[PDB]
């Protein structure tokens, strides 16, 4: 009944890493590793842009007079930006770019809480010099895929129709594979060593995530202890 334990999270790259657990018993690490997988793909507090009220945009079916791309496209490239928040769950920013050039993600009103993983992610392409595009980006935090579709039912009467929304996919995690194999300790025939090979987008830290996700499993054990 030996307790379980991890080792140093082997950080090969900033995007993906691998944890390793030595103290596993026969069977546990296998089914629990699969059980963790679902959790590390569902109950994860992700960050996703929800409301983007743009300067000269009443609807996403238009193109800013001065940009190369299309507004609809630009909104998908906003979903392509990985951002971190620390204190508040929500924050409104403002993109301010002018001049011919691939608009990097570091020209925005940078709040101390807003945290980009890569300020080099081009959102749009400015092709003119006298075009200063501005856009308030309301990003927040939640978990799982929560689309603007399911959210427009309450609506709160969004009369200000300059405010164009987007689907909030709250998922940091990405590709999860687990490498089960014989755990070689000298006092036992063979235990189990779970080498969790994980891919992330680069927003929430793995250890933060796994203790947090295990606490969600704790929530999901509550009634399983209650009879």
């Amino acid at each position: 009944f030996l307790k379980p334990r991890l080792v140093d999270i082997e950080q090969v790259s900033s995007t993906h890493a691998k944890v390793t657990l030595e103290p596993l018993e026969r069977g546990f690490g296998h089914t629990l590793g699969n059980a963790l997988r679902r959790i590390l793909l569902s109950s994860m507090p992700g960050c996703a842009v929800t409301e983007v009220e743009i300067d000269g945009v009443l609807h996403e079916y238009s193109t800013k007079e001065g940009v190369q791309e299309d507004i609809l496209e630009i909104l998908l490239n906003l979903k392509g930006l990985a951002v971190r928040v620390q204190g508040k769950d929500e924050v409104i920013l403002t993109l301010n770019k002018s001049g011919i050039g691939p608009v990097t993600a570091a020209d925005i009103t940078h709040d101390g809480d807003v945290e980009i993983v890569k300020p080099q992610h081009v959102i749009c392409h400015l092709t003119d010099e006298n075009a200063s595009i501005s856009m308030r980006i309301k990003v927040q935090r939640g978990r799982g895929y929560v689309p603007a579709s399911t959210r427009i039912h309450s609506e709160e009467d969004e009369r200000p129709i300059g405010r164009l929304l987007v689907d909030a996919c709250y998922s940091p995690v990405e590709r999860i594979a687990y490498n089960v194999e014989a755990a070689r300790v000298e006092q036992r025939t063979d235990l189990d060593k779970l080498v969790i090979e994980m891919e992330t987008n680069g927003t929430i830290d793995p250890e933060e995530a796994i203790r947090r996700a295990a606490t969600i499993l704790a929530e999901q054990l509550e009634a399983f202890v209650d009879l």
């Binding site: 997988r37 679902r38 793909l41 569902s42 590709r175 999860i176 594979a177 090979e197 891919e199």
Partner: peptide, 14 residues
């Protein structure tokens, strides 16, 4: 179905 039910190979890519 959610990508969580997807059968993946040795790699991890579902």
């Amino acid at each position: 179905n959610p990508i969580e039910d997807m059968p993946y190979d040795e790699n991890g890519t579902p």
